[PDB]
Structure 1
Amino acid sequence: GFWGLEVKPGKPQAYNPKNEQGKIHVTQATLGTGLSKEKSVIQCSIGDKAPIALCSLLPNKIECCPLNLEFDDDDEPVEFTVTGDRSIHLSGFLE
């Protein structure tokens, strides 16, 4: 089952893994539409832990990058932060 999520830039965006039925496999991060040349980073913060940079995407150089991440119900607060002004599309599959 295909899975997708657009994580908007600016204000950091929360995400709830329990919304989906099964485990989320984040296998790709794709840069959204935009005009800024600045490097874009998506950071994942679990609970009160410090954010961990999932990947770095370079506009016009590397606009997509493979990922291998698994999100389940165990980490109750999942909070995605995106640097820059371009959205980052996370794609993958369920279970």
Structure 2
Amino acid sequence: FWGLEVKPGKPQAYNPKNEQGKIHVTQATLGTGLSKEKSVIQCSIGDKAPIALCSLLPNKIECCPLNLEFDDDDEPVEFTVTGDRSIHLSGFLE
């Protein structure tokens, strides 16, 4: 089992080399709070333009299935969350 809480108020580096296998990210879940603003999580692989991975809507869509693979070769990964609420990534190691 694998999980990471990405906080909103600062872009967050993640290093897949710290995991003993390939990371399967299979879900994003909205963290606690009262904010009704959309929460978007973006991903940049070293210094490339960020790509939006999903978009959660408080009281409508508070989780969504993903199917992403991060390995050693994804040098530094940078996760950025828009909005006032954390996004919980979950999945498993291969």
The answer to whether TM tops 0.5 is: yes
CA deviation after TM superposition for structure 1 residue 85, in Å: 1.1
Identity in percent = 100
For residues 58 and 64 of structure 1, the distance between their equivalents in structure 2, rounded to whole angstroms, comes to 9
In the alignment of these two chains, the number of paired residues is 94
Q: Which portions of structure 1, spanning 4 or more consecutive aligned residues, are displaced by more than 6 angstroms?
A: none
For residues 19 and 61 of structure 1, the distance between their equivalents in structure 2, rounded to whole angstroms, comes to 35
CA deviation after TM superposition for structure 1 residue 36, in Å: 0.4
**TM-score, normalised relative to structure 2:** 0.98
Unaligned runs of 5+ in 2: none
**TM-score, normalised relative to structure 1:** 0.97
Per-residue CA distance 1:10-60 (angstroms, 9 max, x = gap): 111111111110000000000000110000000000011100000000011
Q: How well do the aligned residues superpose, as a CA RMSD in angstroms?
A: 0.5
What's the counterpart of residue 35 of structure 1?
Answer: 34
For residues 83 and 64 of structure 1, the distance between their equivalents in structure 2, rounded to whole angstroms, comes to 15
For residues 5 and 26 of structure 2, the distance between their equivalents in structure 1, rounded to whole angstroms, comes to 14
CA deviation after TM superposition for structure 1 residue 77, in Å: 1.1
Unaligned runs of 5+ in 1: none
For residues 10 and 50 of structure 1, the distance between their equivalents in structure 2, rounded to whole angstroms, comes to 19
Q: 1:60-79 residue pairs with structure 2 within 5 A?
A: 60-79=59-78
For residues 15 and 7 of structure 1, the distance between their equivalents in structure 2, rounded to whole angstroms, comes to 10
